Amino acid sequence: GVYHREARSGKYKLTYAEAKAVCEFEGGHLATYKQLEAARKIGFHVCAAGWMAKGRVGYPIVKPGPNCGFGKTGIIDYGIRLNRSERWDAYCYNPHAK
Secondary structure (H helix, E strand, O other), X not given: OEEEEOOOOXXXXXXXXXXXXXXXXXXXXXXXXXXXXXXXXXXXOOOOOEEEOOOEOEEEEOOOOOOOOOOOOEEEEOOOOOOOOOOEEEEEEOOOOO
């Protein structure tokens, strides 16, 4: 099961190597785009872009709203930003995540 998580305690300020570590520390790892889909089908909408794949960031906005709904509905992924030093969250994943 893929889930969304923030930094050690802060939000919107995670990197690639960081988001990944945070995952393995919370019982899981950086999910993938495909996995994000399967999560979307159940209603997994989080404006907090989660670091996944080689370093792709995105946030599936199903429920529009201030500081969230960008107008459109669906996974908001602009693709790699040529820099995994961005400030986002992390879409962990773990069939147990215990």
